Amino acid sequence: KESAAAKFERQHMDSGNSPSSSSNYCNLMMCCRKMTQGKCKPVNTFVHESLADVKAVCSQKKVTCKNGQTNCYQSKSTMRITDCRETGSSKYPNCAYKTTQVEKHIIVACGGKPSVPVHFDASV
Amino acid sequence: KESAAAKFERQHMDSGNSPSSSSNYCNLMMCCRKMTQGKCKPVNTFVHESLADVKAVCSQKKVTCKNGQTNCYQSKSTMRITDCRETGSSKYPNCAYKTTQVEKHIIVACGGKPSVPVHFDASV
C-alpha cells in the first residue's frame, strides 16, 4: 500500500529534470524503446537528425567497423546525437543510464537493398 | 520477427526530440510513473522544483480547492511545471500526451501530520 503523500511524489514530482533538460532521457527511452528487457543494453546512441539524413550515411565515407567487418560508413558532418551509457551502479532490473548530448560523426553498418543502416557502430 | 533495419530505427532514431527538447516527455514519464496502467490518466502535472519547495506551499496562501474542499494552498512564487494532457488520438493501451512547459503558481491540497502535499489541484 502507498500513502497519499508518496502517491503525490510519484505522480507530481520530477525535481532536477524537465522537457528542456531531461537528464533522465536515456532512462526513459531505453525503457520505452525496449532495450531493458531481460538485461540492460549497455550502450546505445539516439540520433536526432532526419531519417533520410541518416540513411544517407550509407553513401558516405566507407570505413572499417570496430570489430573489423568492412560494411561501415562514416557521416560527412557531425550529427546531433545523445549517448546513453549504463552508469557504474546500474543493476537490472533497474537499468540506469548517463545521458550525454553531443555533436559528432557517426559510423553505422549498412545492409540490404537499398543499403540502409542496420547497426550503429560508433560516434567519433 | 523484426528486421535489422527496423531494429535500427527502434533503437537509434529520434529525430525531432532530444534531452533538451523532449516533446515526448509526458508520454515517457506518464508510463514510467505508472499513470497508464489500466487506463490513461487524463491530465497530470509534473513539478520541477525541490521537494522542500513544494512541501513549503503547505505553509502559504490558504485557498479553496476546485471541488470546494478547503485544505488547498497556493504557491507565492511560480514553479517550473509541465502539463501532461491526453491528445485526440490517445486511446488505451496506447496513451498519447501533449507536453506543455510553463511557469505558474501551483495549488495543492495538503494533509496529514505533519501537513504535506497529497493532491495537485491546479496552476495559476
Ligand SMILES: Nc1ccn([C@H]2C[C@H](OP(=O)(O)OC[C@H]3O[C@@H](n4cnc5c(N)ncnc54)C[C@@H]3O)[C@@H](CO)O2)c(=O)n1
Ligand atoms: N557509440 C556507440 C557504441 C556502441 N553502440 C551500440 C550499438 C550496438 O547495438 P546495435 O546497433 O543493436 O548493433 C548490434 C547488432 O548489429 C548487428 N551487427 C553488428 N555488427 C554488424 C555489421 N558490421 N554489419 C551488420 N550488422 C552488424 C548484429 C547485432 O545484433 C551495441 C553493440 O555494439 O553498441 C552505440 O549505440 N553507440
Ligand SMILES: Nc1ccn([C@H]2C[C@H](OP(=O)(O)OC[C@H]3O[C@@H](n4cnc5c(N)ncnc54)C[C@@H]3O)[C@@H](CO)O2)c(=O)n1
Ligand atoms: N492541471 C492539472 C489538473 C489536474 N491534475 C491531476 C491531479 C489529480 O490527481 P491527484 O493529484 O492524484 O489527485 C487525486 C487524488 O487526490 C485526492 N484528493 C482530491 N482532492 C483532495 C483534497 N482537497 N484533499 C485531499 N485529498 C484530495 C484523492 C485522489 O485520489 C487528477 C484528478 O484531479 O488530475 C494535474 O495534475 N494537473
